[PDB]
């Protein structure tokens, strides 16, 4: 469970925002891409798994589930690729809520940056630092993974 | 003071620039390929970093990025103390130089498995961070920051 991530893809300004959520903590990484292809998704997972211990990924849709490039990246990085089917239905709502939160932050900083990608990274910054402890998502992920290392 | 300190490091390969941030206390890195090191690239890269780890201090890699107003804007935004990168401890220039070689060596060993340099560079970041030294850099940074919170 310290190793489970969920991929999430949302839209804004006719661009695509790919998001990985660390399910246990709510911590995210996100990027702007021109379209969600297998190649983007695979490259994004390679980045994530080099930066956090990614054991399992719940892919956002069936195309990325099926994608050969995605499977190659998952194999390369040691990731157990899974579907992202909400066998707990509160899953669709939690994600939908995140997407709305993120878009609201992106809107609040909209003005401080010329490009959408800068706004998105500002929104990642704010989401990850936001106090619940009240511990933030960033503190939780570190706490979860550190606990896990000492066992 | 050590859990928040990062060092910027810029190196070259295949006519492109590899921008690296090293968590000084753990050796853990993030890195990107850019067409050229500009203030804007450096500022955007720092914004990314500080959204993903608690970045308190950055030692910039050179005086241009030290001076750059875009880099100062991103440091301000993200709450980062921008410092110089003067190796007051000389054991620094040597540690950074070794890393760059280690990275290029890893990039060379994977270079065949990916069409693009960016992919090879992220493979290298993956290999460096996971390498057992037997704790890894990725293990160390989590333990350093966890200890700090608690
Ligand atoms: O003006 C500000 C304040 C600020 C605070 C934090 C980060 C960036 C910026 C910033 C501009 C900017 C800078 C670099 C970029 C970039 C943009 C942008 O305007 O989108 O796009 C890609 O690299
Ligand atoms: O530990 C981590 C991992 C991480 C990853 C990304 C962002 C923050 C953090 C983080 C901690 C943290 C969190 C929120 C904060 C904050 C701190 C902090 O510096 O302790 O101070 C302001 O709001
Ligand atoms: O073939 C493989 C094996 C592999 C293992 C891990 C990650 C990528 C790849 C990969 C290809 C690839 C995929 C996406 C990319 C990308 C490349 C590339 O070939 O550089 O460049 C940008 O997005
Ligand atoms: O805890 C962290 C943070 C982190 C950030 C980035 C990469 C790895 C890790 C990491 C741990 C880890 C490290 C090396 C390994 C390894 C593990 C692991 O999965 O625990 O298993 C194989 O070599």
Residue numbers in the entry:
A (entry chain A): 57 to 188, 192 to 210
B (entry chain B): 56 to 188, 193 to 209
What is written in the article reporting this PDB entry?
IN is a critical enzyme in the HIV life cycle as it is required for the integration of viral DNA into the host chromatin, and therefore persistence of infection. One component of this complex is lens epithelium derived growth factor (LEDGF/p75), which has a conserved IN binding domain (IBD, residues 347–429) that mediates binding. Within the IBD is a loop (residues 362 to 369) that binds a pocket formed by a dimer of the HIV IN CCD. We herein present a novel, small molecule inhibitor of HIV IN that binds to the LEDGF site, discovered through fragment based screening and structure based drug design, which has low micromolar activity in both biochemical and cellular infectivity assays.
One of these analogues, lactone 1, was identified as a new hit. One of the hits that demonstrated good density in the LEDGF site was lactone 1, which was found by SPR to have better affinity (750 µM vs 1570 µM) for the core4H than the core3H construct of the CCD. Core4H has a Trp131Asp mutation not present in core3H, and this residue forms part of the wall of the LEDGF pocket, suggesting that this compound would not interact as well with wild type IN. However, the electron density found in both sites did not closely match structure 1, but instead closely matched the acid form 2, which is an isomer of lactone form 1. Additionally it was found in the crystal and in assays that 1 existed as the ring-opened form and this form (compound 2) was as active as the original sample in SPR assays. Compound 1 was from the CSIRO library and was not tested in the AS, but the ring opened form was synthesized and tested and showed the same structure and binding mode in the crystal structure. In addition, the carboxylic acid of the compound makes a virtually identical interaction to Asp366 of the LEDGF loop. This charge interaction is key to the series developed here, to the series of peptides that have been shown to interact with the LEDGF binding site on HIV IN, and key for the binding of other small molecules that have been developed by other groups.
